[PDB]
Amino acid sequence: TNLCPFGEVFNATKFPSVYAWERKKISNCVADYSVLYNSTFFSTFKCYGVSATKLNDLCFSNVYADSFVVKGDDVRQIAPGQTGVIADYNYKLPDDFMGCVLAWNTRNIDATSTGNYNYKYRYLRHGKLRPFERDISNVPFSPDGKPCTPPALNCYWPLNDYGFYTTTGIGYQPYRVVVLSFELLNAPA
Amino acid sequence: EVQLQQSGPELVKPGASVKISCKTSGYTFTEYTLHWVKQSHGKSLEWIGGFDPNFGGATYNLKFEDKATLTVDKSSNTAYMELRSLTSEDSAVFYCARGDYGTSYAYFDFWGQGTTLTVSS
Amino acid sequence: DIVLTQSPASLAVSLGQRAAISCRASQSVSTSSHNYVHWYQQRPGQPPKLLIKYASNLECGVPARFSGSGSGTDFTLNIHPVEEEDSAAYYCQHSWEIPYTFGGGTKLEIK
Amino acid sequence: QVQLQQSGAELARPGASVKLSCKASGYTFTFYWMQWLKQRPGQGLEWIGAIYPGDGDTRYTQRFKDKATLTADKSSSTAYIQLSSLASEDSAVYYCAGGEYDNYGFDYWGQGTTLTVSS
Amino acid sequence: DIQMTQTTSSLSASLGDRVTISCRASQDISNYLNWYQQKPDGTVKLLIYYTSRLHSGVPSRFSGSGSGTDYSLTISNLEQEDIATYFCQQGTTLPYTFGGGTKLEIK
Amino acid sequence: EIQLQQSGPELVAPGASVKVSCKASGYAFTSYNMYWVRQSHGKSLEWIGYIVPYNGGTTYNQEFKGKATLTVDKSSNTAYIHLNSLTSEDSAVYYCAKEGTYYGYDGVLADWGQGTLVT
Amino acid sequence: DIQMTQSSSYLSVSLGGRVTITCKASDHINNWLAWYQQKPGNAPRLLISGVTNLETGVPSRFSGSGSGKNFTLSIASLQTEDVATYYCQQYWSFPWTFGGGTKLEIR
Ligand SMILES: *[C@@H]1O[C@H](CO)[C@@H](O[C@@H]2O[C@H](CO)[C@@H](O)[C@H](O)[C@H]2NC(C)=O)[C@H](O)[C@H]1NC(C)=O
Ligand SMILES: *[C@@H]1O[C@H](CO)[C@@H](O[C@@H]2O[C@H](CO)[C@@H](O)[C@H](O)[C@H]2NC(C)=O)[C@H](O)[C@H]1NC(C)=O
């Protein structure tokens, strides 16, 4: 009677880039959990903490659905642990997690023949970031702390572009991601 | 040549919708996208929202998310911009601009003649 | 979102000198590879037209007198040879985030 | 850096209502919760209620169910608790606090405003 | 509601020694405890967020430990700057609750 | 290339305990899992469990709850299985496997070792 | 413990023919299946991830089919290498049970 808005966040037309991932809280509905069981559409579908039979248990306090776009080589970093250029600078999952990580290949949409330069990823930042904390600030990095303005002496801009094409391999093709996170915590539904 | 055109201009009194069209010609329609802008008689431009004919969906600016919707017929290669709840501030030009391939658009290279709305009584 | 301010408001130039329209951004726009700002001129009563893509590259079908500059927050448009036809409104456009806003707009008047 | 600027001191009169504040700047406000804590003078903190400013979802405790009503505005990046039906007992210190992952503690804390009810 | 009982409400210690603050829970909180510092100005900051020593931007003289239902944090060598009140917070189950706190002062 | 290799062939009298390694080389070992399947001579394939490398958390099929204790050594990228209370009827090859580098599902194995053998 | 069995352990089709291997399911698996292949003396290799997505780096004769409970796999025509056994595996429950196998020996 009230189907949850999985039909908005999964089938969207522009996922945000991984430095500026969004989040849509979903509550007070009924979750279908049966249209995302196609095994040749998605790729990963790996879940920690709970099994992949979530149609029965109503882990339904809230479900936070983050979503971004990563390169094919580093969709493995969307996982607990996993030190790397994506996962300790852009989106750090905590060590415990009841979350569900889903991903899928989108060479058809997000990659062109001339070259996509619209998705970004922050690659160089002062230290690690904690679980679930994002950064959107684009100020130029300098390894001393004091600020620069590049192209001056050995201090660059803290972002890069994925550079998506349609001629490259699998590992450089875009993978759209959506990360659920069940947060049961003794609430009403 | 790249041929973009809209329909004729129209005036509608406040409280009624309007369906602007944009017919295109000169390229394969499913490759490139279409976008729309608005500029109110001496002010600056602003981006309304684009359509992906290949993927099927549509994206919007958050400032225009309610009053405008986008709808495309793929065979006739016409996009149907449509507004509702028109007031005096929705009285401006309306261009039908062409971007790049889906979810990679950065510059609207080729444009159309543009239609003007004037709410009246 | 991101708002673009323009300076000067109405710059008047003559044929022997150059015109400098300065489009300053709110936050930083550039990455290490590209610079995400594109330009547009608009002759009156007519739709706009692309001049510069990605702040340095000029389009095909240009009179080769339009070339941009700047990286970071500061961006500008250079017209070193000036003649009669480029008396129009000139617009800035950023591509950093999904909502794209356009700039304010300056005019060019010749004595 | 991330700071939670909070309101200054206030004075009130019994039977009235006070609209407090908690300004959040430096991190994204629409994505995470925001908890409200009340400290009696010389006792431990107690959890009043939490608000998710993405759509105004709110979770109160059992004691403070009818005294406090929480609301927040997205564009101002502020949260509002409005204490209601004030008696002489509510003279305390009110902390606003919030963080990214709520299992791993409330990281960001306000300065802590105080409130009194006299004549 | 889970209640947590800091049995000691005050403490006295020297400088440079090793002090220890205990905190018990009513039911097994399944290792979701975290320690808070309240300096006497009014500002409150976090020290450790998981039980066993997961630090968040703090000098390493604080090193909490303890598992199950009985927990404690400790300072290896004291300093004159961190004489404050220390709270243990429960985070297993909403509604969250806090401890009574132990006040610190020189010997 | 992704190169996994176990130890040499093994042999033991019943009632004893065996340890056999599986050295991983050619990728980042803290990323993928390490699976362990069992295969008797000319028979089907039967599971033992899996092990996450960075965390050390394990999960066993309940056939082998008191027979195998999985462990791992993150320093030199070597995974182990420590067979305990072993008897006959265990005479089988023991493969160590991991998931595909671009698939991402749990049970799908796409990179196998050579194979040990026990008596 | 969900189960996946095959009908025949032996199936003999001559070279250049057309084979059909089938694996039934005990309970319901949505769409999640995998196929394997091992010549004796080696380790098995992944063949068909999902029901009909071929693994990259294989001949394109194979194509799985079927949904619901019943599942199958067809080869276009045999060669000198496709004389090995084939395991049908699900990955929908926890114990990812394989099949009984099916050997294709030349008649
Ligand atoms: C996204 O779009 C797909 C279609 O491309 C949706 O899948 C359909 O779901 C409806 C309702 O259950 C079915 O009737 C269709 O047969 C499905 N089509 C296919 C091809 O699977 C999907 O539900 C949408 N939303 C999500 C959550 O991904
Ligand atoms: C699961 O997803 C796959 C891939 O999106 C679907 O297979 C596609 O189906 C459409 C419509 O029949 C075809 O036009 C495509 O060519 C198919 N692609 C592939 C890779 O085969 C499949 O139908 C979906 N299944 C379910 C359960 O909806």
Author numbering:
A (entry chain E): 320 to 508
B (entry chain H): 1 to 121
C (entry chain L): 1 to 111
D (entry chain A), F (entry chain C): 1 to 119
E (entry chain F), G (entry chain D): 1 to 107
Provide text from the study.
The trimeric S protein mediates SARS-CoV-2 entry into host cells via the RBD, which binds to the angiotensin-converting enzyme 2 (ACE2) receptor. Three representative bnAbs, X01, X10, and X17, were further identified to offer potent cross-neutralizing activity against most VOCs but with a decreased neutralization breadth against Omicron. High-resolution cryo-electron microscopy (cryo-EM) structures revealed three nonoverlapping conserved epitopes and defined the structural basis for the neutralization breadth of the three bnAbs. Based on the previous categorization strategy, the nAbs X10, X01, and X17 are most likely classified as class 3, class 4, and class 5, respectively.
Cryo-EM structures of SARS-CoV-2-S and SARS-CoV-S in complex with three nAbs simultaneously were obtained at resolutions of 3.48 Å and 3.83 Å, respectively. As for the SARS-CoV-S:X01:X10:X17 reconstruction, we could classify both trimeric S (∼49%) and dissociated monomer S (∼6%) proteins in complex with the three nAbs, suggestive of a less-potent dissociation efficacy of the nAbs on SARS-CoV-S as compared with SARS-CoV-2-S. In the 3.74 Å structure of the trimeric SARS-CoV-S:X10:X01:X17, all three RBDs of the S proteins in the trimer were noted to be in the “up” conformation and bound by three antigen-binding fragments (Fabs) simultaneously; only one RBD was found with strong Fabs densities, while the other two RBDs showed relatively weaker densities of bound Fabs. Notably, three RBDs on the nAb-bound trimeric SARS-CoV-S were raised to extremely open states (compared to a “closed” RBD conformation), ranging from 85° to 87°; this was compared with 42° for a typical open RBD in an S protein. Together, these findings suggest that only sufficiently opened RBDs can accommodate all three Fabs—especially for X10 and X17—simultaneously and avoid steric clashing and trimeric S disruption. In addition, 11 of the 20 residues of the X10 epitope in the SARS-CoV RBD are conserved among SARS-CoV-2 and SARS-CoV, with the remaining five residues harboring substitutions with the same class of hydrophilic amino acid. Consequently, these substitutions lead to three hydrogen bonds in the interaction between the heavy chain of X10 and SARS-CoV RBD and seven hydrogen bonds and one salt bridge for X10 with the SARS-CoV-2 RBD. Notably, compared with X10 and SARS-CoV-2 RBD binding, the interactions between the light chain of X10 and SARS-CoV RBD are enhanced by the presence of an additional hydrogen bond (eight vs. nine, respectively) and a salt bridge (zero vs. one, respectively). The epitope of X01 on the SARS-CoV RBD comprises 17 residues, as compared with 18 residues in SARS-CoV-2 RBD, of which 14 residues are conserved; this conservation accounts for the comparable neutralizing potencies of X01 against SARS-CoV and SARS-CoV-2.
